[PDB]
């Protein structure tokens, strides 16, 4: 509980690609109770996205293997049990982050920016649970509910070109497409976000083009 020490270490851990270390550091910049700068929250996000991302990758791999054993019972059972182990890790990581969001980051948010950032983050980490989840409905509902609130706020309090605004639309559209099997809604959500941003760009900035490009890329995919 050193303060700026824990952050500079988070930054060293990042450069070293030791994302478990980085996430322990950022979690301590959080379990204290103080709120977070634009830098420190991006650190939290980077650490945890990589930590869960490794389990996500592995989890997809072992599930695919668990589906492709040629009725090789013993291979399939071992794949099932390993996926279950990876699934426990993955769920524990989500639960941690969601706990920090629920108990520390969302209650202390203040600006609309942050509330939308954190609620998007809550959407995300419930989405990742939805990927692997009788508690499915429920996890899916918490995800939706967090994205919806963030969306509502972002509509009212943010420019359409704002990257947090765009990234929420992008991830919310992915949630519809991937978790709720709702391509038309997903496409309408991304297209509208893209359309409002591009119109603003004649009428919030560095990363506007990057996220807009991900909306267009998904739109191309889904409509071909």
């Amino acid at each position: 509980m050193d303060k700026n020490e824990l952050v500079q270490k988070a930054k060293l851990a990042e450069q070293a690609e030791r994302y478990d270390d980085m996430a322990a550091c950022m979690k301590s910049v959080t379990e204290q109770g103080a709120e977070l700068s634009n830098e420190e929250r991006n650190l939290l996000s980077v650490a945890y996205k990589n930590v869960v991302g490794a389990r996500r990758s592995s989890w997809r791999v072992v599930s695919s293997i668990e589906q492709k054993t040629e009725g090789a019972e013993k291979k399939q059972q071992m794949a099932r049990e390993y996926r279950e182990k990876i699934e426990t890790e993955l769920r524990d990581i989500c639960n941690d982050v969601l706990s920090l969001l629920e108990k520390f980051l969302i209650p202390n948010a203040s600006q609309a920016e942050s509330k939308v950032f954190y609620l998007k983050m809550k959407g995300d980490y419930y989405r990742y649970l939805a990927e692997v989840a009788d508690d499915k409905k429920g996890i899916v509902d918490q995800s939706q509910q967090a994205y919806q609130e963030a969306f509502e706020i972002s509509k009212k309090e943010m420019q359409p070109t704002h990257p947090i605004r765009l990234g929420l639309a992008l991830n919310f559209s992915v949630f519809y497409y991937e978790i709720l099997n709702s391509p038309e809604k997903a496409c309408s959500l991304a297209k509208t976000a893209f359309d409002e941003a591009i119109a603003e760009l004649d009428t919030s900035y560095k990363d506007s083009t990057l996220i807009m490009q991900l909306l267009r890329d998904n739109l191309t995919l889904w409509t071909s």
Binding site: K49, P163, L166
Partner: peptide
């Protein structure tokens, strides 16, 4: 094919 989601800003 999976879609892309947001980067960690």
């Amino acid at each position: 094919r999976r879609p892309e989601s947001a980067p960690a800003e």
